[PDB]
């Protein structure tokens, strides 16, 4: 099936239920990246649990097929399935993620940040026109090619919403979580959440590029969550001194607690930071 | 200070507030591993936040100095401090972590598992005699040397308890968390927790080596936490079929919800699995 067509190489990355490796296509001798997903739960899960994970994986593949073709989104080339594993073959990105890049440069400039955010907002705008929420936006899920162009990946928690539908689950990566998803977990009489969670996360990304660290970074998780819930953050000490007031205005429109008042992708691309007159 | 004595190389690992790199000692030309900790919070934290992180780091160094000398614990060689960073120089472990090892072999045998667990329990027994709790036991924090001997590391959340003292904070890695720490977060009138959380985590480690996956592995975090709280797990389908009833008895004595009934390190080393007569 997959091992008769491809040859497995080294580990490029790892997830909760997946391992990402470099692989050679036997026929053409070209290199690709393969996500190996274990639906059986490492050693063993229940049949119910297995079906939940098999249905989550098929929705991932579905969104990947719908968004195919966009120049700044990763391309899924070929999928394979067995009773325990799923194999998703993707284009290989040699310069890795935006997280690795940030680690080497510590902080990025206002000009380099405008480049990346203009591309990222364009992708978000496209997805939201189709009613799709990514739901896991972060530096580790944004890859770079040889020309340093961004390529969005990991659509594992993604959803295409129906007219009227709202999501109720608590999922994501802790320091990028919007406050409405955390609100959802403390009150079972909450209305739900929608596409707006992606804009908060976008804001966390943008602040982290410019300052070197995340806006709501704290040692104790309980206080981190209280800080994100109240929107307690700041552009402090010497760090943000070199930066204009326009970038800071844009970041603060993303970091708004009430989702109905938060900026959208369309509105963010119209801001003076990307130009206005 | 640190850059005048050592030369920095590649990234070997990354944490929430730290980056671990390979480095050459200028004078002797020998290779070491250096943990770079940012107390300033990436770009910027508050003065309060900074002092909390600076005091957490100094306690880490303290425990590292107290436990120094044990053959199966990592050795801290040299520390450096500035206003924003902390530099902790350690012995370099070329074969990496037990997590990377597990990924390549998928599952380990009963005999290979007896080797690792006998060593790990010995270290835990030593620490608990000194009243020290590690509080973050997991495959990613257990390193291997050239002879494949285990070396315990990451004492970032560790504590030496006073006569009578109990801990009240919620910290660790989600799938290895004992139920008493999760109980602590839902009821502010709980008595606290102690050294017993390390034994639960030890149990999660042992099951994960043998089966290939963690005992309480589920897609939705809310249900994962309910599963760990109730102790709902199983030795299912074909996975555990090859294994004896003695290993399974030992794992189930670790995975006990009531901490007063849970096995200790001393008791675990006396079990028939490691020998009895």
């Amino acid at each position: 099936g997959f091992y008769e067509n491809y040859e497995p190489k080294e580990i490029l990355g790892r997830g909760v239920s997946s391992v990402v490796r470099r692989c050679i296509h036997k026929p053409t001798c070209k290199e690709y990246a393969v996500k190996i997903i274990d639906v059986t739960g490492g050693g063993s899960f229940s049949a119910e649990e297995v079906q939940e994970l098999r249905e989550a994986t098929l929705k991932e593949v579905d969104i990947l097929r719908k968004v195919s073709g966009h120049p700044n989104i990763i391309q899924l080339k070929d999928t394979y399935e067995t009773n325990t594993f799923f194999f998703l073959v993707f284009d290989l990105m040699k310069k890795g993620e935006l997280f690795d890049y940030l680690t080497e440069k510590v902080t990025l400039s206002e000009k380099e940040t405008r480049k990346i955010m203009r591309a990222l907002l364009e992708v978000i705008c496209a997805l939201h026109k189709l009613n799709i929420v990514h739901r896991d936006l972060k530096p580790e899920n944004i890859l770079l090619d040889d020309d340093m162009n961004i390529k969005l990946t990991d659509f594992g928690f993604s959803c295409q919403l129906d007219p009227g539908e709202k999501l109720r689950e608590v999922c994501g990566t802790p320091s990028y979580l919007a406050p409405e998803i955390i609100e959802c977990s403390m009150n079972d009489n909450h209305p739900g959440y929608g596409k707006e969670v992606d804009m908060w996360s976008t804001g966390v990304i943008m602040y982290t590029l410019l300052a070197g660290s995340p806006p709501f970074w704290h040692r104790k998780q309980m206080l981190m969550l209280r800080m994100i819930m109240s929107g307690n953050y700041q552009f402090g000490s010497p760090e943000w001194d070199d930066y204009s007031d326009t970038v800071k205005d844009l970041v603060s429109r993303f970091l708004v607690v009430q989702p109905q008042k938060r900026y959208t992708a369309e509105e963010a691309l119209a801001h003076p930071f990307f130009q206005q007159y | 200070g640190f850059y005048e004595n050592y030369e920095p190389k590649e990234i070997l690992g990354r944490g929430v507030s730290s980056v671990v790199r390979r480095c050459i000692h200028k004078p002797t030309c020998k290779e070491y591993a250096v943990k770079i900790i940012d107390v300033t919070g990436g770009g910027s934290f508050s003065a309060e936040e900074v002092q909390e992180l600076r005091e957490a780091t100094l306690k880490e160094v303290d425990i590292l100095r107290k436990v120094s000398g044990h053959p199966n614990i990592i050795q801290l060689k040299d520390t450096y401090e500035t206003n924003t960073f902390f530099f902790l120089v350690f012995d370099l472990m070329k074969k990496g972590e037990l997590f990377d090892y597990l990924t390549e072999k998928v599952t380990l045998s009963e005999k290979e598992t007896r080797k690792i667990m006998r060593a790990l329990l010995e270290v835990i027994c030593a620490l608990h005699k000194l009243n020290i709790v590690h509080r973050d036991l997991k495959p990613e924090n257990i390193l291997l040397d050239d002879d494949m001997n285990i070396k315990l590391t990451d004492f970032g959340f560790s504590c030496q308890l006073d006569p009578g003292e109990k801990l009240r904070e919620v910290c660790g890695t989600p799938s290895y968390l004992a139920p008493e720490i999760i109980e602590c977060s839902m009821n502010d009138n709980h008595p606290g927790y102690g050294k017993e959380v390390d034994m639960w985590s030890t149990g999660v480690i042992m099951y994960t080596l043998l089966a290939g996956s963690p005992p309480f592995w589920h897609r939705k975090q809310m249900l994962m936490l309910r599963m760990i709280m109730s102790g709902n797990y199983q030795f299912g389908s074909p996975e555990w079929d090859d294994y004896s009833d003695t290993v399974k008895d030992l794992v189930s004595r670790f995975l006990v919800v009531q901490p007063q009934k849970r096995y200790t390190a001393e008791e675990a080393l006396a079990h028939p699995f490691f020998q009895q007569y």
């Binding site: 997830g15 909760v16 997280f99 896991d136 972060k138 580790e140 594992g156 928690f157 689950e169 608590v170 999922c171 994501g172 990566t173 802790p174 320091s175 977990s185 | 990354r14 944490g15 929430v16 989600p174 589920h218 897609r219 939705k220 975090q221 809310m222 249900l223 994962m224 936490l225």
Partner: peptide
Amino acid sequence: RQMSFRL
């Protein structure tokens, strides 16, 4: 580093 989760 930080991974994703499901409650």
